[PDB]
């Protein structure tokens, strides 16, 4: 049915994880995405994935808007596409995380969406659960998206210049999954890495991230 997301992809009989094309309402061009059909019933559209540091996340607003990298590996879907998808119905957000010592954790939000570009792709979440901290490492109560060329944070400083990448930063706040990818034992003592404070703390840089969405009604 209207392949609007990986949930539709899954309902239509494709039960196997991989690259698919989805047709997002009101977007001009189709979009290739990774679909995770494994976690917890499947139907997850991946909006961010990191695992090796091959792809650099130190980009500007335009690139954070339109997306970068490739769905076969590491990528950012793009805010314009995250908006367009999450406009077409109510979606939940799940975030899969792994440290360098083999531990996996996840955070999950019952409700997720972002505003439009004029709203600086502001973030709204509700209903945090999971094994990657009792509190949410993403701020629930509203933060614009910021990049090195768009200072929209709640700080008198510039969080994108200090922590790297593009994220919904507060006083930078308790996360940045789009920070610098550090490898091996370098995961220790890094302040501008790939961080999720309530899981491994402000100094740990994570081994892999996947952020993915699917409809509430799935």
Structure-determination technique: X-ray
* Element of type H or E holding 87: helix 79-87
Give the other-Cβ count within 10 Å of 54's Cβ.
11
Q: Please give the domain boundaries of the chain with CATH numbers for all domains.
A: 6-142+204-215 (3.90.215.10)
Which of 38, 121, 129, 130 has the alpha carbon at shortest distance from 83? 121
Contact 179, 193 (CB under 8 A): yes
DSSP character for 41? Answer: G
Please report the resolution in angstroms: 2.3
According to DSSP, residue 69 is labeled: E
Neighbouring C-alpha atoms within 13 Å toward the C-beta of 78: 16
CA–CA dist 130, 183 (Å, integer): 25
Whether 6 contacts 44, CB under 8 Å: yes
Buried b (16+ CB within 10 A) or exposed e, 77-114: bbbbbbbbbbebeebbbbbbbbbbeeeebbbbbeebbb
Pairing state of beta strands 68-69 and 44-50?
Answer: unpaired
Residue 159: CB atoms within 10 A of its CB come to 24
Beta partners for residue 76, in sequence order: 48, 68
Instruction: Return the beta strands (E) in the chain as ranges.
Output: 18-22, 31-36, 44-50, 68-69, 75-76, 91-98, 104-114, 123-130, 175-176, 195-196, 208-215
Contacts of 93 (CB under 8 A, 6+ apart): 108, 109, 112, 125, 211, 212, 213
- Residues pairing with 209 in the sheet: 50, 97
């Amino acid at each position: 049915g209207s392949f609007r997301d990986c949930a539709d992809v899954y309902q239509a009989g494709f039960n196997k994880s991989g690259i698919y094309t989805i047709y997002i309402n009101n977007m001009p061009e189709p979009k290739k995405v990774f679909c995770n059909m494994d976690v917890n019933g499947g139907g997850w559209t991946v909006i961010q994935h990191r695992e090796d540091g091959s792809l650099d996340f130190q980009r500007g607003w335009k690139e954070y808007k339109m997306g970068f990298g490739n769905p076969s590996g590491e990528y950012w879907l793009g805010n314009e596409f995250i908006f367009a998808i999450t406009s077409q119905r109510q979606y939940m957000l799940r975030i899969e995380l792994m440290d360098w010592e083999g531990n996996r954790a996840y955070s999950q939000y019952d409700r997720f969406h972002i505003g439009n570009e004029k709203q600086n792709y502001r973030l709204y979440l509700k209903g945090h659960t999971g094994t990657a901290g009792k509190q949410s490492s993403l701020i629930l109560h509203g933060a614009d998206f910021s990049t090195k060329d768009a200072d929209n944070d709640n700080c008198m400083c510039k969080c994108a210049l200090m922590l790297t990448g593009g994220w919904w930063f507060d006083d930078c706040g308790p996360s940045n999954l789009n920070g610098m990818f550090y490898t091996a034992g370098q995961n220790h003592g890094k302040l501008n890495g790939i961080k999720w404070h309530y899981f491994k703390g402000p100094s740990y840089s994570l081994r892999s991230t996947t952020m993915m969405i699917r409809p509430l009604d799935f």
